[PDB]
Amino acid sequence: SVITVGPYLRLHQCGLPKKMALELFKPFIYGKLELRGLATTIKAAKKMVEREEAVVWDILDEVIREHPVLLNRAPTLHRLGIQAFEPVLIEGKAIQLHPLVCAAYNADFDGDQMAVHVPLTLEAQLEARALMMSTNNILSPANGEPIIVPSQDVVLGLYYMTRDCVNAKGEGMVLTGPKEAERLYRSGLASLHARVKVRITEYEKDANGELVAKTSLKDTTVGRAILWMIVPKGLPYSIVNQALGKKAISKMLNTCYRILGLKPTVIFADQIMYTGFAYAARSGASVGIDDMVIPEKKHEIISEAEAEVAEIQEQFQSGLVTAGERYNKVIDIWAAANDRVSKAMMDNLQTETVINRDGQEEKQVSFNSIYMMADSGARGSAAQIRQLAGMRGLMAKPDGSIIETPITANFREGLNVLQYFISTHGARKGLADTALKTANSGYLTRRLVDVAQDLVVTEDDCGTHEGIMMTPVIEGGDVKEPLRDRVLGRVTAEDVLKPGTADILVPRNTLLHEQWCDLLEENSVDAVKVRSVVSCDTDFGVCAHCYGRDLARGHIINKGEAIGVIAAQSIGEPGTQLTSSIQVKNKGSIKLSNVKSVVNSSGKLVITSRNTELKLIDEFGRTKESYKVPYGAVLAK
């Protein structure tokens, strides 16, 4: 049946139709009826459930209460594509899904349908609530990051909650605690987003397995002081002071889970959903046609960039330039205009707020709606805001040859008959390609699960000393992915060393969690030999002390879990999204790694060997910026 919103549901429950549930559980309802003596034999029992006598709906309420069910979408990619919830009888023909797990199924509410299943045998009833439940998978098997992270309407709420205008009611005042903060907001006196200073209590468990208290006067806003009551216990107050983007709301949940355990992150995430929808409504957020402002300087930019193509065209008429360099000149001088207008509207929709407090004036980030929608990470991106205000871009022909006559207009101004027809190509080829990547993605994950499958954790510890050497990629200017992300969730193959040796910070095979990892962050160590699934000693499958930890849970992987299926699934799920002179930006100490050289006349450096890696070492000691230097260079250092 069709799926609708569950905003009133707890993370562990979902809605189900009454008349559908009467049929689904019918064999249970029979026995439960004749067990209470409501019906003599089976024939009278079904004769009652056919009449839908009012006594049987309560019997159903009994057998459906703690008995879990199974939902699922039409496409299934990652293992989280099927999640079991607890049934809640709802009057209607439509099924209701929880919004937090909605990001898992990739379920839009635009008319998709969901399948329900009943775990009949007792062992299945247990496996549905144990490993198939919601709370038990909060972390995608693809990456240990939260899969429950609020999507759009809710993060619009927390974003509107944490903000500060330069001036508002309750400015520069002190309150005793959060209860007086919300007590101040619900009275129509204090402003939601306003500059305040309130006293709160931020606990920290940084002692050994024991929560320690603390208190202070923290600089914050009314909205952030209200948002703190949601944060459980030992989390610090430094997490709730910020604009609260859809990103910064993630690390909050991840930290909560890896600190307080599973339950506080569950009830906590749910509470975040409730308050976020709450104040997301009370915010009165909307979008107008005037909420998208066009730069006043656009027409002049259009006339200038269109005035350069007249020069290049006249040069093509005068014989100076040629078609090869003029076709490439007009496209560049036209694209620079799109960049200019992008920066113009990004300036005029961002910091343009001109607002007065006490004395003359001050400027801040704008309260414009659509801007906040893009800034909070709720829905829409700065690319789309660019197309919706300034010139949307340039379009090509069926082959993909970019036309020298870009799209000057936008969606705010009426498009002409040419621009729509020229955009039809890009639209149609986009739809066709993105429609093809579905069959490509399934065709991929199918092969990948075909080759892996039977690979399953078999032995706990195979006792091997072999493992890969993990290092950050350090691409170009700065590292693309750091050591922490390629390390966390795994187990070392050998003890590494501090600056002083003979001291063992990591003793041979040990899981690296937030403790050992941040401990390595205390030191400068950039490399460790991790145990890898490819280096595993044991035969016929992998080992938990090799495969590492990462799963829906932050604990080390258990024995007898099939890794290949979930790995291939994790690769196949994100298949739809698929389509000079060197210097250093930051200061450091230039260090040449594994090079032979020689001094030229009268003296300077010239490279002899082939492989040359120029590594930047700043005053910290981290090996930082790497530029591969060719053969026979001239080094001024």
Partner 1 sequence: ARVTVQDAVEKIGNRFDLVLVAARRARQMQVGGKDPLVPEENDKTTVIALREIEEGLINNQILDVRERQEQQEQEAAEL
Partner 2 sequence: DIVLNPLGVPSRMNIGQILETHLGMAAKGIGDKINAMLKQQQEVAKLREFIQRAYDLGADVRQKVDLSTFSDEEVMRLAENLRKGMPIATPVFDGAKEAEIKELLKLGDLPTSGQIRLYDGRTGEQFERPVTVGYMYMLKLNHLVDDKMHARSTGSYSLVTQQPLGGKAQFGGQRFGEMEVWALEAYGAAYTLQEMLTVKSDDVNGRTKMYKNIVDGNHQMEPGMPESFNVLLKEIRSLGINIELED
Partner 3 sequence: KPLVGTGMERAVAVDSGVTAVAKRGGVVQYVDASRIVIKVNEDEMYPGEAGIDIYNLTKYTRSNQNTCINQMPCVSLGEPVERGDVLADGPSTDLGELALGQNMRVAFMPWNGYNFEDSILVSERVVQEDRFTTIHIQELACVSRDTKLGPEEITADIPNVGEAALSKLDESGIVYIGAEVTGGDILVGKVTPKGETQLTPEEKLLRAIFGEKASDVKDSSLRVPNGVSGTVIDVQVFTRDGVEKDKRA
Q: What angle do CA 188, 194, 199 make, to 5 degrees?
A: 95
Partner that binds at residue 131, options partner 3, Zn ion, Mg ion, none, CB closer than 5 to 8 Å by kind: none
Give the contact letters, 270-299, x = binds to partner 2 (CB under 8 A), - = no. Answer: -----------xxxxxxxxxx---------
Q: Report which of 309, 306, 294, 291 is spatially closest to residue 391, judged by C-alpha positions.
A: 294
Give the contact letters, 71-90, x = binds to partner 2 (CB under 8 A), - = no. Answer: -x--xxxxx-xx--------
536 is in an annotated binding site: yes
| Identity of the amino acid at 519 | L
What residues numbered 9-28 form the site for partner 1, per CB under 8 A?
Answer: 10-13
**Cβ-defined contacts of 379-385 (< 8 Å, 24+):** 379/152, 382/346, 385/292, 385/345, 385/346, 385/349
**Does the protein bind partner 1 through residue 429 (CB under 8 A)?**
no
**What is the residue whose two structure tokens read 């915010």?**
283
Shortest distance, CB of residue 458 to Zn ion, whole angstroms? 10
What residues numbered 450-509 form the site for Zn ion, per CB under 5 A?
Answer: 462
DSSP 606-623: EE-SS--EEEEE-TT--E
Q: How far is Cα 572 from Cα 583, in angstroms, rounded to an integer?
A: 39
* Torsions phi, psi for 47 (to 5 deg): -60, -30
Q: 278, exposed or middle or buried, with CB in 10 Å at 0-12, 13-18, 19+? A: middle
Q: Which of 415, 444, 605, 629 binds partner 2 (CB under 8 A)?
A: 415
Cα of 402 vs its chain's centroid, Å: 33
Query: Angle of helix 323-348 relative to helix 298-318, nearest 10 degrees?
Result: 170
What residues numbered 242-271 form the site for partner 2, per CB under 8 A?
Answer: none
Question: Given the complex with partner 3, which of 220 and 368 has the nearer CB atom?
Answer: 368
**Does the protein bind Zn ion through residue 222 (CB under 5 A)?**
no
Q: Which of 27, 31, 236, 261 binds partner 1 (CB under 8 A)?
A: 261
The tally of CA atoms less than 13 A away on the side-chain side of residue 248 is 14
Q: 440, exposed or middle or buried, with CB in 10 Å at 0-12, 13-18, 19+? A: middle
**Does the protein bind partner 2 through residue 7 (CB under 8 A)?**
no
Shortest distance, CB of residue 282 to partner 3, whole angstroms? 9
**Does the protein bind partner 3 through residue 223 (CB under 8 A)?**
no
Question: Given the complex with partner 3, which of 280 and 455 has the nearer CB atom?
Answer: 280
Give the contact letters, 88-117, x = binds to partner 3 (CB under 8 A), - = no. Answer: -----------x--x-----xxxx------
Partner that binds at residue 141, options Mg ion, Zn ion, partner 2, none, CB closer than 5 to 8 Å by kind: partner 2
DSSP 466-485: --EEE-----BTS-SS-TTT
110 is in an annotated binding site: yes
554 in Cβ contact with 524 (< 8 Å):
no
568 in Cβ contact with 445 (< 8 Å):
yes
Q: Which of 236, 507, 560, 621 binds partner 2 (CB under 8 A)?
A: 560
The DSSP secondary-structure symbol of 117 reads B
Partner that binds at residue 462, options Mg ion, partner 1, Zn ion, none, CB closer than 5 to 8 Å by kind: Zn ion
Shortest distance, CB of residue 277 to partner 3, whole angstroms? 4
**Does the protein bind partner 1 through residue 136 (CB under 8 A)?**
yes
Binding residue count for partner 1, defined by CB under 8 A: 28
Pure H helices in 162-198: 178-185
526 is in an annotated binding site: no
- The residues that bridge with 199 in the sheet, in sequence order, are 217
Q: How many residues does the chain have?
A: 637
Partner that binds at residue 108, options Zn ion, Mg ion, partner 2, none, CB closer than 5 to 8 Å by kind: Mg ion
Shortest distance, CB of residue 15 to partner 3, whole angstroms? 13
What residues numbered 146-175 form the site for partner 3, per CB under 8 A?
Answer: 151-154, 156-157
Partner that binds at residue 337, options Mg ion, partner 1, Zn ion, none, CB closer than 5 to 8 Å by kind: none
**Does the protein bind partner 3 through residue 406 (CB under 8 A)?**
no
**What is the residue whose two structure tokens read 């197309």?**
387
- The residues that bridge with 605 in the sheet, in sequence order, are 599, 635
Q: Which residues bind partner 3 (CB under 8 A)?
A: 4-5, 7, 99, 102, 108-111, 151-154, 156-157, 273, 277-278, 280-281, 283-287
Residues at the annotated binding site for Zn(2+)? 462, 536, 543, 546
Q: Which residues bind partner 1 (CB under 8 A)?
A: 10-13, 65-67, 86, 122-123, 125-127, 129-131, 133, 135-136, 261-263, 266, 553, 555, 558-560
Residues at the annotated binding site for Mg(2+)? 108, 110, 112
Q: Which residues bind Zn ion (CB under 5 A)?
A: 462, 536, 543, 546
